[PDB]
Design a protein around this ligand. Structure first.
Ligand code: 8AC
Ligand code: 8AC
Ligand code: 8AC
Ligand code: 8AC
Ligand code: 0FU
Ligand code: 0FU
Ligand code: 0FU
Ligand code: 0FU
Ligand code: 0FU
Ligand code: 0FU
Ligand code: 0FU
Ligand code: 0FU
Lengths: 130, 130, 130, 130
């Protein structure tokens, strides 16, 4: 409404249901979130990754097939998405995914984090080239 | 080259590695194929479905998350894809996926089919509305 | 240690990282948890299900391939697992999966639940027959 | 019947619907097969792997969660399975998966292979230790 955020558009997607697990309270071993189109299109999918230790500032596929890559900066809960549409067109988008972490019960430094608010991202073309 | 087929374009995708299984030599219980962008974009994924009995002229998701649906007419090896880009824009596309079936060994009427040639599809906008 | 729970055995598995989403604060649309062997075997996997509305007291596969089924009673956070080992042998197992739900941000009655403690299940043979 | 093969048992599984793709007619980039219990138990799943280049004599998980690993010797179409049941018990099993390869259409040296017969494997305990 009067929120300083655009919540609909052909190049605007909603990010929701952020999850992550920090098995030792530091790095994530599991991270994910839902991505949905806002323009009445069909797109609605999970973007996630797992590893013994997930890295910051590293591209992960959103899934086995996915046309989308993502990267995370855990220090700022910052998400970066990338979509390469053609040889010459790539979109990127960013957001903060606010979340709350609490003890998960599976070890003395095990924490699980979940989103406390949705975020909206805008996809914008990267100049060809850098 | 001199083939009566367009093999590159922003709205042209390559279909390859068609597979299917007909457990009793009639209906499919498993069907799939690979879809790849031709314009240098990243898109490259598997579209598939399984059921005790897959139906002709029925939409199946390409995968759990997928932004794409497909339907198959097994009588003509005809594929139909659909992509709903927005409230008002939907693309559809069609092709024939030539294939060869041979005995699969898992029952006396078990046949497995695999693609013998790639196919190229063109995505075109459905008039709003029918 | 002095806890009234068995945490290791060939037929004892650890349940951890319970998650669930209640989009309208009532039924789950997403539920899952991790299952791990305690006896030094390799088994370690996710059991989950999604639907527009998940049902209580209904078997869901743990995953596409899984040899395990589960059911949930949301009124008591009660889990039931079933493993059919042979024509004549089926194991079942139960537990409570304690969890905490909090607002998820994706709608005014959206809640996300996560496990606050691990649980241990014991697999026991169902008499042949009921 | 009078076949020199055991087709049923608690430790005997049926292997069927072998598939593989050799993009350049040499190494596989995709390999898979179905595994089913013969004793009336529920087990029935796909074991597969993909990579730019799959390696011989290397363990691959059967799937993301799987309790089973496999390895393949492409020179003899030989399959090896491994199941670690406990700290001290591991089963292994072997078979030949007969198959036929034919041109797949997606490049001049692209071949796709599919099983021509089912195979039966027997799981047997590895002595503790080697
Ligand atoms: N006129 C067509 C506008 C809809 C384009 C939306 C593309 C979003 C994307 O996948 O980045
Ligand atoms: N100028 C942008 C043209 C590239 C658009 C390709 C969209 C293909 C699709 O997902 O249907
Ligand atoms: N002596 C063999 C004992 C290990 C059996 C564990 C089986 C657990 C299961 O999948 O239910
Ligand atoms: N008496 C119980 C016998 C059934 C055991 C089958 C175990 C097969 C496996 O997962 O290797
Ligand atoms: N929706 C969802 N949330 C999660 N925490 C996980 N792990 C998962 O796989 N899917
Ligand atoms: N970590 C994680 N979060 C999610 N939301 C999902 N779907 C998933 O599979 N994994
Ligand atoms: N005009 C247009 N641009 C895009 N980036 C996409 N994906 C699309 O479908 N149409
Ligand atoms: N039937 C089928 N075909 C395919 N090409 C793939 N990837 C799949 O998962 N299933
Ligand atoms: N809901 C849910 N929870 C999980 N722990 C996982 N792995 C999953 O895929 N989905
Ligand atoms: N049943 C099946 N066969 C295949 N060739 C493939 N690729 C797949 O994913 N599933
Ligand atoms: N290569 C391959 N073969 C299969 N039989 C299956 N299920 C799969 O996913 N991939
Ligand atoms: N006696 C027995 N041995 C095994 N190896 C397994 N898996 C099982 O369920 N029961």
């Amino acid at each position: 409404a009067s929120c300083p955020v655009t919540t609909e558009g052909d190049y605007v997607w909603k990010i929701s249901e952020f999850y992550g697990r920090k098995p030792e309270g530091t790095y994530y071993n599991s991270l994910g979130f839902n991505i949905k189109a806002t323009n009445g299109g069909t797109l609605d999918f999970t973007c996630s990754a797992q590893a013994d230790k997930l890295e910051d500032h590293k591209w992960y596929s959103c899934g086995e097939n996915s046309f989308m890559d993502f990267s995370f900066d855990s220090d700022r809960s910052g998400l970066l998405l990338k979509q390469k549409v053609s040889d010459d067109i790539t979109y990127v988008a960013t957001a903060t995914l606010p979340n709350y972490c609490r003890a998960g019960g599976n070890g003395p430094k095990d924490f699980v984090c979940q989103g406390v608010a949705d975020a909206y991202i805008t996809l914008v073309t990267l100049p060809k080239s850098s």
